[PDB]
Design an enzyme around this catalytic site. Structure first.
Site, PDB file in Angstrom:
ATOM      1  N   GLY A  24       0.842  -1.178   0.000  1.00 13.94           N
ATOM      2  CA  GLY A  24       0.000   0.000   0.000  1.00 13.94           C
ATOM      3  C   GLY A  24       0.876   1.227   0.000  1.00 13.94           C
ATOM      4  O   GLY A  24       2.110   1.147  -0.007  1.00 13.94           O
ATOM      5  N   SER A  25       0.266   2.408  -0.006  1.00 13.67           N
ATOM      6  CA  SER A  25       1.093   3.590  -0.228  1.00 13.67           C
ATOM      7  C   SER A  25       1.977   3.937   0.975  1.00 13.67           C
ATOM      8  O   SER A  25       3.055   4.496   0.788  1.00 13.67           O
ATOM      9  CB  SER A  25       0.235   4.771  -0.669  1.00 13.67           C
ATOM     10  OG  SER A  25      -0.684   5.075   0.349  1.00 13.67           O
ATOM     11  N   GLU A  27       3.640   1.941   2.556  1.00 14.87           N
ATOM     12  CA  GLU A  27       4.721   0.974   2.526  1.00 14.87           C
ATOM     13  C   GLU A  27       5.666   1.218   1.330  1.00 14.87           C
ATOM     14  O   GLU A  27       6.749   0.637   1.280  1.00 14.87           O
ATOM     15  CB  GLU A  27       4.164  -0.466   2.505  1.00 14.87           C
ATOM     16  CG  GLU A  27       3.287  -0.781   3.776  1.00 14.87           C
ATOM     17  CD  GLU A  27       1.955  -0.048   3.798  1.00 14.87           C
ATOM     18  OE1 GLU A  27       1.253   0.159   2.769  1.00 14.87           O
ATOM     19  OE2 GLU A  27       1.529   0.320   4.855  1.00 14.87           O
ATOM     20  N   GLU A  46      -4.635 -10.070   2.836  1.00 16.73           N
ATOM     21  CA  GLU A  46      -3.682 -10.164   3.944  1.00 16.73           C
ATOM     22  C   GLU A  46      -3.818 -11.427   4.791  1.00 16.73           C
ATOM     23  O   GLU A  46      -2.809 -11.860   5.362  1.00 16.73           O
ATOM     24  CB  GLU A  46      -3.739  -8.936   4.829  1.00 16.73           C
ATOM     25  CG  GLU A  46      -3.322  -7.663   4.096  1.00 16.73           C
ATOM     26  CD  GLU A  46      -4.378  -7.003   3.219  1.00 16.73           C
ATOM     27  OE1 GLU A  46      -5.526  -7.493   3.110  1.00 16.73           O
ATOM     28  OE2 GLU A  46      -4.035  -5.928   2.656  1.00 16.73           O
ATOM     29  N   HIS A  69      -0.471  -3.218   4.885  1.00 17.24           N
ATOM     30  CA  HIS A  69      -0.858  -1.839   4.734  1.00 17.24           C
ATOM     31  C   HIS A  69      -1.738  -1.331   5.886  1.00 17.24           C
ATOM     32  O   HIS A  69      -2.930  -1.655   5.979  1.00 17.24           O
ATOM     33  CB  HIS A  69      -1.633  -1.649   3.410  1.00 17.24           C
ATOM     34  CG  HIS A  69      -2.129  -0.253   3.259  1.00 17.24           C
ATOM     35  ND1 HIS A  69      -1.273   0.824   3.261  1.00 17.24           N
ATOM     36  CD2 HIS A  69      -3.384   0.256   3.231  1.00 17.24           C
ATOM     37  CE1 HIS A  69      -1.977   1.939   3.167  1.00 17.24           C
ATOM     38  NE2 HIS A  69      -3.262   1.623   3.168  1.00 17.24           N
ATOM     39  N   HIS A 280     -11.783 -29.120  23.637  1.00 17.95           N
ATOM     40  CA  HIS A 280     -12.641 -28.461  22.663  1.00 17.95           C
ATOM     41  C   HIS A 280     -14.103 -28.628  23.126  1.00 17.95           C
ATOM     42  O   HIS A 280     -14.705 -27.699  23.684  1.00 17.95           O
ATOM     43  CB  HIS A 280     -12.285 -29.102  21.339  1.00 17.95           C
ATOM     44  CG  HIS A 280     -13.041 -28.601  20.183  1.00 17.95           C
ATOM     45  ND1 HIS A 280     -12.867 -29.138  18.924  1.00 17.95           N
ATOM     46  CD2 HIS A 280     -13.995 -27.659  20.069  1.00 17.95           C
ATOM     47  CE1 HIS A 280     -13.673 -28.528  18.075  1.00 17.95           C
ATOM     48  NE2 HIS A 280     -14.367 -27.629  18.742  1.00 17.95           N
ATOM     49  N   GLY A 400      -7.990 -23.071  15.492  1.00 16.53           N
ATOM     50  CA  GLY A 400      -9.232 -23.545  14.887  1.00 16.53           C
ATOM     51  C   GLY A 400      -9.759 -22.574  13.855  1.00 16.53           C
ATOM     52  O   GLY A 400     -10.889 -22.713  13.411  1.00 16.53           O
TER      53      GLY A 400
HETATM   54  C1  TZD Z   1     -12.645 -18.075  10.646  1.00 15.17           C
HETATM   55  C2  TZD Z   1     -13.647 -19.152  11.008  1.00 15.17           C
HETATM   56  N1  TZD Z   1     -14.952 -18.997  10.750  1.00 15.17           N
HETATM   57  C3  TZD Z   1     -15.805 -19.961  11.052  1.00 15.17           C
HETATM   58  C4  TZD Z   1     -15.357 -21.100  11.735  1.00 15.17           C
HETATM   59  C5  TZD Z   1     -16.276 -22.209  12.124  1.00 15.17           C
HETATM   60  N2  TZD Z   1     -16.114 -23.491  11.525  1.00 15.17           N
HETATM   61  C6  TZD Z   1     -16.653 -23.861  10.291  1.00 15.17           C
HETATM   62  C7  TZD Z   1     -17.359 -22.871   9.349  1.00 15.17           C
HETATM   63  C8  TZD Z   1     -16.488 -25.226  10.007  1.00 15.17           C
HETATM   64  C9  TZD Z   1     -16.918 -25.999   8.788  1.00 15.17           C
HETATM   65  C10 TZD Z   1     -15.839 -26.284   7.807  1.00 15.17           C
HETATM   66  O1  TZD Z   1     -16.383 -26.967   6.694  1.00 15.17           O
HETATM   67  P1  TZD Z   1     -15.516 -27.736   5.737  1.00 15.17           P
HETATM   68  O2  TZD Z   1     -16.270 -27.933   4.483  1.00 15.17           O
HETATM   69  O3  TZD Z   1     -14.183 -27.063   5.517  1.00 15.17           O
HETATM   70  O4  TZD Z   1     -15.221 -29.139   6.420  1.00 15.17           O
HETATM   71  P2  TZD Z   1     -16.222 -30.260   7.028  1.00 15.17           P
HETATM   72  O5  TZD Z   1     -17.360 -30.401   6.111  1.00 15.17           O
HETATM   73  O6  TZD Z   1     -15.375 -31.492   7.057  1.00 15.17           O
HETATM   74  O7  TZD Z   1     -16.637 -29.775   8.404  1.00 15.17           O
HETATM   75  S1  TZD Z   1     -15.665 -26.038  11.307  1.00 15.17           S
HETATM   76  C11 TZD Z   1     -15.555 -24.579  12.227  1.00 15.17           C
HETATM   77  O8  TZD Z   1     -15.025 -24.467  13.410  1.00 15.17           O
HETATM   78  C12 TZD Z   1     -14.002 -21.145  12.041  1.00 15.17           C
HETATM   79  N3  TZD Z   1     -13.459 -22.262  12.784  1.00 15.17           N
HETATM   80  N4  TZD Z   1     -13.159 -20.213  11.665  1.00 15.17           N
HETATM   81  C1  TZD Z   2      -6.697  -4.005   2.730  1.00 19.98           C
HETATM   82  C2  TZD Z   2      -5.812  -3.197   1.803  1.00 19.98           C
HETATM   83  N1  TZD Z   2      -4.657  -3.693   1.342  1.00 19.98           N
HETATM   84  C3  TZD Z   2      -3.913  -2.978   0.515  1.00 19.98           C
HETATM   85  C4  TZD Z   2      -4.284  -1.663   0.203  1.00 19.98           C
HETATM   86  C5  TZD Z   2      -3.473  -0.799  -0.703  1.00 19.98           C
HETATM   87  N2  TZD Z   2      -4.020  -0.397  -1.955  1.00 19.98           N
HETATM   88  C6  TZD Z   2      -3.980  -1.165  -3.121  1.00 19.98           C
HETATM   89  C7  TZD Z   2      -3.477  -2.618  -3.154  1.00 19.98           C
HETATM   90  C8  TZD Z   2      -4.439  -0.472  -4.252  1.00 19.98           C
HETATM   91  C9  TZD Z   2      -4.559  -0.952  -5.674  1.00 19.98           C
HETATM   92  C10 TZD Z   2      -5.931  -1.335  -6.098  1.00 19.98           C
HETATM   93  O1  TZD Z   2      -5.896  -1.812  -7.430  1.00 19.98           O
HETATM   94  P1  TZD Z   2      -7.137  -1.898  -8.272  1.00 19.98           P
HETATM   95  O2  TZD Z   2      -6.877  -2.827  -9.390  1.00 19.98           O
HETATM   96  O3  TZD Z   2      -8.347  -2.288  -7.458  1.00 19.98           O
HETATM   97  O4  TZD Z   2      -7.406  -0.436  -8.832  1.00 19.98           O
HETATM   98  P2  TZD Z   2      -6.449   0.586  -9.649  1.00 19.98           P
HETATM   99  O5  TZD Z   2      -5.712  -0.187 -10.656  1.00 19.98           O
HETATM  100  O6  TZD Z   2      -7.420   1.534 -10.276  1.00 19.98           O
HETATM  101  O7  TZD Z   2      -5.536   1.239  -8.629  1.00 19.98           O
HETATM  102  S1  TZD Z   2      -4.906   1.153  -3.840  1.00 19.98           S
HETATM  103  C11 TZD Z   2      -4.480   0.918  -2.182  1.00 19.98           C
HETATM  104  O8  TZD Z   2      -4.568   1.814  -1.242  1.00 19.98           O
HETATM  105  C12 TZD Z   2      -5.453  -1.193   0.791  1.00 19.98           C
HETATM  106  N3  TZD Z   2      -5.889   0.167   0.562  1.00 19.98           N
HETATM  107  N4  TZD Z   2      -6.217  -1.945   1.548  1.00 19.98           N
END
Ligand code: TZD
Ligand code: TZD
Ligand code: TZD
Ligand code: CA
Ligand code: CA
Ligand code: CA
Ligand code: CA
Ligand code: CA
Ligand code: CA
Ligand code: NA
Ligand code: NA
EC number: 4.1.1.7
Lengths: 525, 525, 525
Positions: A24-25, A27, A46, A69, A280, A400
């Site tokens: 980002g800018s 950086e 990220e 960023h 768990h 998890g």
């Molecule tokens: C960031 C995030 N969001 C939601 C969950 C909740 N979560 C979720 C959404 C699961 C289901 C994953 O499904 P899968 O298709 O990857 O695998 P299975 O069908 O084998 O459970 S297991 C679990 O703890 C999590 N652990 N982390």
């Molecule tokens: C979460 C996140 N990560 C990285 C950035 C940095 N960032 C980035 C990666 C940009 C480029 C976006 O590219 P784009 O293709 O969407 O559009 P343009 O080509 O018109 O810049 S503009 C900017 O501030 C951000 N603002 N937010």
């Protein structure tokens, strides 16, 4: 010298040569004039940047350096930081801040109260009070990430700092060596060894810090000398022991009563490199049964403090495992007998049982494959069915948190170019960090991604069963074409709707010269 | 009554009927027995959940309710929270915690030090000390999100709380009405009105809280009475004024010196509903030129405190805009003359100039379209080329955080089913929250996504130019097939490589009955 | 069992038998039915409570337990916590919270966001999620305070928790033993020992963690074997070495350039148990001169990380000092020669020079006296003039925070009933924690308080000189009658206006059976 030149010199002198980033800018003044001896690994979001860096750090057993960023970029990475905190991953997370002259007005891209943003998921979090302090702050970040217990750290740097003059005394930072490679004093170590030597029926429980320390071989020697069964502590983020060694007894159930029943009759239980314990499900009962005492060796004071039972020793896992393995007596007890092979589950010519998938991977994968697991309803079968002989062969999201395995598998593959990485990921989990696929395509990092597609969040159906919870929304994820997603990001894609196609796809994937995604149609739970 | 029953009753009595979520096991006891009068909107990753809820809240002008999983789910959403903080979005973010009996041992899925996790990006953050307190804590969360200055709030709830008995005194929470609809006292309001009436050359600057308050029409009346030019404050997250009204002068440049030069010769500058100011590039000089004084009306004490110049009044934007519009005199000065239409840029039969894209959207879109912008290098052209007559017609990530527009466009479309939403998103930005497309497909929310594909992070090339920064890695994003990504998530997809194809694709998209993605090949910068 | 009974059992089983407190209503349910085997030490203000407990913990070398009232009581103690953080003092700070049923409404005496209040001055800060968790949370607090690097911790407990039923599994907490008594692995320890054995002109620098570990005698053996001069690291909170041993070279100046010049010509400088370094005045220059390398042994990762130069080893000071002292070779170099005695300063029959006071104390005090210093302008003379042969003979506020020595001297005297404690405190410093005198009177703790009365904040005149700062308000403190203050709190009081009276007063004080305050008229700077 400039702060920019001094900081890159510090990084290279401390062994860092790769930046995982999404730019980002704020950086650009850091990334400009990027040194020719460094590489930059771009990821498109990220959570993916941090997941890749995390797999790289865990497999390499060294710190990884990240550049994000400001607040939004840091914030997009905080689920990934929750896993890194639990896995003790040595991650140096840097984020660019606005120029010092506009921080006060809160210009766009100002990271407000920056050091508080990633708390409580970092060991150290800081923004320097001046440009000349930047190299010293980076030095603190490197050592804080790297000392036991390892973990992520955060440094926010105003973009105008990089071009300022460095302090000429910053050169004293470059070659600092900091060690936490410590073990229990001789007298108390002798007391511990005598307790182990005297035990009538010891058991060993190993956690992820064993694999992080590469203490696996020393733990094998220890188990052989004590003639003791070995289990992996619950909710395991890594594999700390060869899974077909005769002492191995598998993954512990993640429940209080289940663990005390498993350990019943063992007089001394030695836990190395694990929290006590990462339960768990809520399975109330005794922490330990009468007749069992527990001794934990951990690299983390927070783990030692919070254990509900047992004695604890806070020390480096590598140093302690080596000392114990070399000091204990060879017991005259018989060596434990290896667990029997798992049974073959009946498989028709339709959708795949997960057991069939793991058996087939075990048959076809190289003996030094590395597996990642984010197939949440199939973890027990995975642990029963994959023979993992070597260290660094298994990763699972330590908090998890979904969205780890897909990017981490790319970082592990970058760290271990001669070991084939195979990520086994559910259709639900695959979406959290799907854009990481692009980094594998762009840099030609030849990870194999096996998507277990059963159309649902299967583990959440399981836990709903445990709770007896009905009329729950949001559990199904129909309508995702993973071959099209792979094509979208430039990765070769295959589909396996039955066993014949699974074998053909794996043969093609294992022969390929780049990353490959295989969408496997698995049975609905 | 249970805590579960009491809490859903509180939510419905406070006007909440939709849960935006991605579920986990700590949340199943909340989501079970889901009430028949509520709807659940699933998204596949938490940045997407929060972005959808944020667009919904901003367009609806009411709080949106979110349910996430513990620390990892909260953490995945924190980049989205950084935008919500800057846009004053009233978001009630709930996350499930482990059962109280295992919080201390830090079982898997425990959210450690939970209330600190989303800080500093929330107005209020809390975990209740007992199950019976949960409804009162939810009441606090609802009102904290909804009072001026609106913003996101966080509540962590142990999963075992839901089935416990509620406090019978919780019924007093259900119908509480809390108002912050306030304006400056009569005497001081009269002083302000006299200063406006007396100004020889006033200017008006409007920010996003005008559009949030639906104060747009009152600001039109105010500008017409004062016969004053109107600009939108820099880094604009919303559009607060009709862009072809004769008083409109466009988006201000986000620089200190550029703004003081623009305002030179204006004796009184009245800023309503904006920070003073959300500068971006560092363009040092005078905050205001001699002869210009500034008066800011803001709903946010933090904005009033940090302005580097001017007087400030902290009050509700809707109430203040209505009072000023109705109290000022009609000036005898001539009404400002409308800005000329933008010029047509030369366009050959190849890749599209962004100017051509916006002109064509303006030609073809309905007059009540709603636009979202995450095409970072083309913002100035967008603001010049789209006639936005109505309130709620424009959204841009308020903290500059990528990953907002794609999910927010789905939430805006859900809030405004009779207004066609058109999200204009760069090829870089599209990846951050790409999985949100699935929610549009599943619920048939007919958002149109226009992907501006130029292969690079174009704005970062621009800022690199400003800084004169060379040898910067990570700026190109080749090799993404957005039609395949759309197919992956079930969304109809079209490609436009030239103007004829852009017009054909837009005609098809505008006629479609579901969401549509158009990948547009745009000129490389 | 109740939470109350279980918690007191845990405390006694972990060696705690004394509560230092100032009570309030949130604490009455904890303090009721106070066990007959515990003692309660009341102080009249919380800075005094914590200071007394801190002196007790530092002298006893074990954790001290504190009970304070909610936010106001905790807040009154936070200056004392700043010193405890710097001295690594193992303090378990508990505070009572409102009943869980009124926390949400913020009843009077609610400690809002309690765990954040003492941050960043505590290692661990927590409020339990349920009553049954209280004993486990107390267990965490005990071990967190006690593990290296030791430090203060905070636990907030809702008052209604104490009478609730405890978890029957809490008994596993009672006898947990947690060790951090670790040292560098053999191979790397051998490398260190060889570097020490090979050094041509080594120097040793010792800090307060040496005295905390009672490693003083091992450091004497180490210095004798290496035939090396020994200095105490700057801003010293404790005395780690006998001050008339031939190797002793005194307190280091607290300046960057001054320290590198002092160490010039020493090829290896071994720092044990100190930050590198606690500089004070800004004295810019080289951190070390060419030819000098530094090796630090510290119990605190934060110290190892932030050192601007040198290698570091993070390990227990007691274990490392013992191992080094026993492993190094006896050098054939000549033992360093003892420093000459200090000169007698000319003293007339009027007000006392501080040098005269310290010489007279050294002449008259027992050889096992313990001194505390809060006479800020006379520290250098104190270190030159008091022969301190034994460990635990000197305390100085580790963060420079006034208000430590007066209460800490009472806690040290309680810890060491057979060693006469003599606190030397300036007339300015005496006021910060003056009410602590009452605790000495009430419990008949026979501390001697020597008030150095020169009418001014003398050290602040000194620093003003360094900065060349003129026209500074607030530096004089005329008009305080310390004998009347002592009478107010029940302590016998004497005045010494000249040397004859100083000797007579000290003879009377040393013969007394209770605490005594001597107000000494010292020369104005
Ligand atoms: C960031 C995030 N969001 C939601 C969950 C909740 N979560 C979720 C959404 C699961 C289901 C994953 O499904 P899968 O298709 O990857 O695998 P299975 O069908 O084998 O459970 S297991 C679990 O703890 C999590 N652990 N982390
Ligand atoms: C979460 C996140 N990560 C990285 C950035 C940095 N960032 C980035 C990666 C940009 C480029 C976006 O590219 P784009 O293709 O969407 O559009 P343009 O080509 O018109 O810049 S503009 C900017 O501030 C951000 N603002 N937010
Ligand atoms: C809590 C607190 N407040 C104020 C100070 C500042 N301070 C003050 C007020 C000093 C003067 C102490 O005067 P004294 O009479 O105790 O001793 P001298 O006259 O020998 O300096 S030295 C110093 O650092 C402090 N260190 N701690
Ligand atoms: Ca190169
Ligand atoms: Ca699934
Ligand atoms: Ca319905
Ligand atoms: Ca682009
Ligand atoms: Ca008694
Ligand atoms: Ca004084
Ligand atoms: Na945070
Ligand atoms: Na605080």
């Amino acid at each position: 010298a400039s702060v920019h030149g001094t900081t890159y010199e510090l990084l290279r002198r401390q062994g860092i040569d790769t930046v995982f980033g999404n730019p980002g800018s704020n950086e650009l003044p850091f990334l400009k004039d990027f040194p020719e001896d460094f590489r930059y690994i771009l990821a498109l979001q990220e959570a993916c940047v941090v997941g890749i860096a995390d797999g790289y750090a865990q497999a390499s057993r060294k710190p990884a350096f990240i550049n994000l960023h400001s607040a939004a970029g840091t914030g997009n990475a905080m689920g990934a930081l929750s896993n890194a905190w639990n896995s003790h991953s040595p991650l140096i997370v840097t984020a660019g801040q606005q120029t010092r002259a506009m921080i006060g007005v809160e210009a766009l891209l100002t990271n407000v109260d920056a050091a508080n943003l990633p708390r409580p998921l970092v060991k150290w979090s800081y923004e320097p009070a001046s440009a000349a302090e930047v190299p010293h702050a980076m030095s603190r970040a490197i050592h804080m990430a790297s000392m036991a217990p390892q973990g992520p750290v955060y440094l926010s740097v105003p973009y105008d700092d990089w071009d300022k003059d460095a302090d000429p005394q910053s050169h004293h930072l470059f070659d600092r060596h900091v060690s936490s490679s410590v073990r229990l004093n001789d007298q108390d170590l002798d007391i511990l060894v005598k307790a182990l030597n005297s035990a009538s029926n010891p058991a060993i429980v190993l956690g992820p810090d064993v694999d992080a320390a590469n203490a696996n071989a020393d733990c094998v020697m220890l188990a052989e000398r004590l003639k003791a069964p070995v289990w992996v502590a619950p909710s395991a983020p890594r594999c700390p022991f060869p899974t077909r060694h005769p002492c191995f007894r598998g993954l512990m159930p993640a429940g209080i009563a289940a663990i005390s029943q498993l350990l019943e009759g063992h007089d001394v239980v030695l836990v190395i490199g694990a929290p006590v314990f990462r339960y768990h499900q809520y399975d109330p009962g005794q922490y330990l049964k009468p007749g069992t005492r527990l001794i934990s060796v951990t690299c983390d004071p927070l783990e030692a403090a919070r254990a509900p039972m047992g004695d604890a020793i806070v020390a480096d896992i590598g140093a302690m495992a080596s000392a114990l393995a070399n000091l204990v007596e060879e017991s005259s007890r018989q060596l434990p007998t290896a667990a029997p092979e798992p049974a073959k589950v009946d498989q028709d010519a339709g959708r795949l049982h997960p057991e069939t998938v793991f058996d087939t991977l075990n048959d076809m994968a190289p003996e030094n494959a590395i597996y990642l697991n984010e197939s949440t309803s199939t973890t027990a079968q995975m642990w029963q069915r994959l023979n993992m002989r070597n260290p660094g062969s298994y990763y699972f999201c330590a908090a998890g948190g979904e969205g780890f395995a897909l990017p981490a598998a790319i970082g592990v593959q970058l760290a271990e170019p001669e070991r084939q990485v195979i990520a086994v990921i559910g259709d639900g989990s695959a979406n959290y960090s799907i854009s990481a696929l692009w980094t594998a395509a762009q840099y030609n990092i030849p990870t194999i991604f096996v998507i277990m597609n059963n159309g649902t969040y299967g583990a959440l159906r399981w836990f709903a069963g445990v709770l007896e919870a009905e009329n729950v929304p949001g559990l199904d994820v129909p309508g995702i074409d993973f071959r099209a997603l792979a094509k979208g990001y430039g990765v070769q894609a295959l589909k396996a709707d039955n066993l014949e196609q699974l074998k053909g796809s794996l043969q093609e994937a294992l022969s390929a010269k780049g990353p490959v995604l295989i969408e496997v149609s698995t049975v609905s739970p």
